Short mmCIF file of C-alpha atoms in Angstrom, two decimals:
data_model
loop_
_atom_site.label_atom_id
_atom_site.label_comp_id
_atom_site.label_asym_id
_atom_site.label_seq_id
_atom_site.Cartn_x
_atom_site.Cartn_y
_atom_site.Cartn_z
CA UNK A 1 49.19 -16.47 -35.58
CA UNK A 2 52.93 -16.16 -36.19
CA UNK A 3 52.69 -12.58 -37.45
CA UNK A 4 51.34 -11.65 -34.02
CA UNK A 5 54.08 -13.41 -32.06
CA UNK A 6 56.84 -12.06 -34.29
CA UNK A 7 55.38 -8.60 -33.70
CA UNK A 8 55.54 -8.78 -29.91
CA UNK A 9 58.89 -10.50 -30.36
CA UNK A 10 60.30 -7.48 -32.19
CA UNK A 11 59.84 -5.04 -29.31
CA UNK A 12 61.80 -7.61 -27.31
CA UNK A 13 65.06 -6.94 -29.15
CA UNK A 14 64.17 -3.28 -29.68
CA UNK A 15 63.91 -2.50 -25.97
CA UNK A 16 67.24 -4.31 -25.74
CA UNK A 17 69.62 -2.36 -27.97
CA UNK A 18 67.73 0.78 -26.96
CA UNK A 19 69.31 0.45 -23.52
CA UNK A 20 72.76 0.28 -25.10
CA UNK A 21 72.06 3.73 -26.55
CA UNK A 22 71.11 5.23 -23.19
CA UNK A 23 73.62 3.15 -21.24
#
């Protein structure tokens, strides 16, 4: 399902900007 992919896809960008906060 798309809802599933989009879900796992979210954490992708999340764990991204998150680094910018700690970096």
